[PDB]
Design a protein around this ligand. Structure first.
Ligand SMILES: *[C@@H]1O[C@H](CO)[C@@H](O[C@@H]2O[C@H](CO)[C@@H](O)[C@H](O)[C@H]2NC(C)=O)[C@H](O)[C@H]1NC(C)=O
Ligand SMILES: *[C@@H]1O[C@H](CO)[C@@H](O[C@@H]2O[C@H](CO)[C@@H](O)[C@H](O)[C@H]2NC(C)=O)[C@H](O)[C@H]1NC(C)=O
Ligand SMILES: *[C@@H]1O[C@H](CO)[C@@H](O)[C@H](O)[C@H]1NC(C)=O
Ligand SMILES: *[C@@H]1O[C@H](CO)[C@@H](O)[C@H](O)[C@H]1NC(C)=O
Ligand SMILES: *[C@@H]1O[C@H](CO)[C@@H](O)[C@H](O)[C@H]1NC(C)=O
Ligand SMILES: *[C@@H]1O[C@H](CO)[C@@H](O)[C@H](O)[C@H]1NC(C)=O
Ligand SMILES: *[C@@H]1O[C@H](CO)[C@@H](O)[C@H](O)[C@H]1NC(C)=O
Lengths: 381, 383
């Protein structure tokens, strides 16, 4: 049932990553709308597909997408804020609903793009099984602003495995958060210590993009990036390959070879998020240089609270049992009053490890829905 | 989509601008052997992927990340030549792909010798298995101690669900479902037209469509037809992945003499594997006539009825307009009392409804083997 719809097109198209797109026409169910073309092509666009073409809604409109009601789905909304049909994009405020889940509300693509110094947006969601064979995507211009309108450049609907289970609540002992039936928004997805991974190289056929993590490091010093040897094989064992592609686990960011400096600092990532949501941090690990337990043992903190410390710090081989075996660990945190998530790691002195270091291979951050809502406020410029 | 040239360590490209990459990072099992052939047959269209092979002396498995809900095209390339320190005629092995048996006791040397070709490409369409890994397992025969397995190239390509139902030959108004079937591509023909390389195939599937003349059994090659310059094939709602436009721009017909056409069947014959159900996909497009009841013809498969009597074939009658392409699927179980090892396709004009012409035509032809008990493996041919 997978779809890649470029809205506002009339023939097939393909982007710079060879992904094939088709017109959205046969899936638009209610309302009126016209095709529109952007008046300015930003040089930061990796492709004109699907960004340069849009469908404009000056009144509510609904898509109906056939899906398997028993399955989880990825939903991607592509937005390219430009001048369409002579309208000022600053008047665009609208709501997007996927069945009973609110994804966006008073959403301003123009404001959101300006705050991120970015010409385009991709909003990605993982929707729990609906038990309905139709996914209704409804666009509603705001009733609070006069001249408000909605727009969309591309829509992707991708069936995906149930890759979410439970997550350990940070700072609490033996408290878990269940995400098995949660609706999630992908906030960030990083190949830590490695290059961007395009969707064409993603596993599971999910065409996820994994970005390099360097822009999110806020500690002084970016550590030391590592790469597995030539033809090193990642031994997934019973972990589904859909969790993350092999190239995620073939690279990592570490603190470095000097244990004394490592003991005096935290490797620190920071991320801007929306307040009043619980977030899941999925940390991907794979040891490809060391071989034994108690060689590399490190503490991990999330928002200044403990996620592996004290007498149970992180040790990849301790968790996996053998070098080359990949793994992930899910942690949960409720964020209220700030609006950023900080991830920190530093060596542990517990148990006298051979080295004083820390490492991480990949990172994903998901927002969990609260009463069927994932929509946050627009950022400040 | 993946094109693995087995036994290589660097990326390569063939004669049709297809890029290939080494297979090593997808191989799960160790202690394989890689070898380069010591003789390059001049009939090879390219040294890629044929001239390099991987050899297995024990069961070996490739693990290829896939999307579980997708149907996939799977191609296996074999070049039974001389490799240093190996006897290729000793090779008998099994190939399975996610619980589907593709080959068993397979001898690439014997198969190549019977076909009088130096290389082999086996192509399969694998139904969704709802797993994110395609496990391709090569098992040397446990009947022969010195038997080993080998492979030169592997292709895995996502493909749409291009198969639905098929009309059962010889029975009226009875259908066969192939939506979830595993298929082997047996023949793929551009009827009346030139070879179409994979680079010119539709839907990114890089299928090759071959001219059909070698398979004509009837006395007389009929008359080939070609559409006018820039003739527009109007697919409408038929997916373009079904077949490229040039398939529908050529056809083979019986000819302009309706009196002679009524006295004979235009006949193709194909060698296949006994004890299997086969689907014949007949591709049609009328690019000369414009009205219903102008060309009306009977079609027979294995001397049995597939559109005859009061429901014969009429392209415009099916399509409604010239220039629109289409296909019809017919299914037949071939055993000892149904042709043995052969499929025969026959067409002749119909006398029902008094058509304006007495002719028949066909634009393309694909033959697929359906799996039985998750098995597609047949015996080796006879020298
Ligand atoms: C719709 O979104 C706009 C933009 O975020 C909101 O307007 C801003 O409100 C914040 C906080 O009240 C101010 O700091 C900004 O200066 C405002 N910007 C603009 C351009 O107005 C607005 O409140 C939202 N409307 C609703 C109904 O939620
Ligand atoms: C494996 O395949 C070989 C090759 O087809 C089989 O050997 C042939 O068997 C046929 C039928 O009896 C004979 O006519 C040929 O002379 C044989 N050729 C050779 C080279 O032996 C063999 O029987 C198959 N083995 C199994 C276990 O199925
Ligand atoms: C765009 O809309 C905003 C709405 O606040 C307005 O201030 C601005 O003048 C508009 N720009 C143009 C070019 O009309
Ligand atoms: C965030 O939570 C505070 C505390 O209850 C509440 O006052 C505020 O309205 C919330 N903001 C949003 C956007 O939900
Ligand atoms: C690491 O971060 C935690 C939480 O922010 C802090 O308590 C600790 O002192 C830091 N450790 C080092 C070595 O900076
Ligand atoms: C074909 O089917 C018949 C009938 O069951 C069986 O006896 C025979 O062994 C089969 N032959 C082959 C080559 O599969
Ligand atoms: C055409 O083929 C059918 C099926 O084999 C046969 O019954 C018929 O006699 C043939 N017609 C001619 C004219 O040979």
């Amino acid at each position: 049932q997978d779809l890649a719809l470029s809205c506002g097109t009339s023939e097939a198209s393909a982007d710079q990553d060879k992904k094939k797109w088709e017109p959205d026409t046969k899936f638009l169910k209610t309302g009126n709308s016209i095709h529109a073309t952007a008046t300015y092509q930003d040089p930061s666009l990796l492709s004109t597909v699907p960004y340069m073409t849009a469908r404009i809604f000056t009144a509510p409109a609904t898509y109906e997408i056939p899906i398997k009601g028993d399955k989880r789905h990825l939903l991607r909304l592509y937005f390219y804020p430009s001048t369409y049909t002579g309208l000022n994009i600053s008047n665009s405020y609208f709501t997007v609903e996927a069945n009973d889940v609110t994804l966006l509300s008073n959403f301003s693509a123009a404001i959101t793009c300006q705050a991120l110094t970015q010409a385009y947006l991709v909003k990605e969601y993982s929707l729990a099984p609906t038990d309905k064979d139709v996914l209704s995507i409804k666009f509603t211009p705001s009733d609070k602003y006069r001249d408000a309108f909605a727009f969309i450049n591309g829509i992707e609907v991708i069936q995906m495995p149930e890759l979410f289970d439970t997550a350990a609540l940070v700072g609490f002992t033996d408290q878990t958060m269940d995400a098995k039936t949660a609706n999630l928004q992908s906030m960030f997805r990083l190949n830590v210590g490695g290059q961007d991974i395009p969707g064409s190289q993603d596993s599971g056929g999910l065409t996820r993009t994994w970005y390099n993590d360097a822009p999110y490091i806020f500690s002084a010093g970016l550590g030391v990036t590592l790469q597995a040897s030539n033809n090193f094989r990642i031994n997934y064992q019973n972990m589904p390959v859909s969790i993350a592609p092999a190239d995620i686990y073939k690279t990592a960011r570490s603190q470095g070879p000097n244990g004394d400096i490592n003991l005096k600092s935290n490797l620190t990532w920071m991320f801007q998020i929306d307040k009043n949501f619980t977030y899941i941090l999925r940390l991907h690990f794979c040891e490809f240089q060391l071989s034994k337990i108690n060689q590399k043992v490190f503490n991990i903190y999330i928002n200044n609270r403990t996620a592996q410390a004290d007498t149970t710090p992180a040790d990849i081989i301790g968790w996996t049992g053998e070098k080359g075996i990949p793994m992930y660990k899910d942690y949960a945190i409720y964020v209220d009053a700030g609006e950023e998530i900080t991830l920190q790691m530093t060596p542990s002195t517990f148990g006298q490890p051979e080295y004083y270091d820390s490492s991480l291979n990949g990172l994903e951050i998901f927002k969990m829905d609260t009463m069927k809502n994932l929509a946050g406020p627009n950022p400040e410029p």
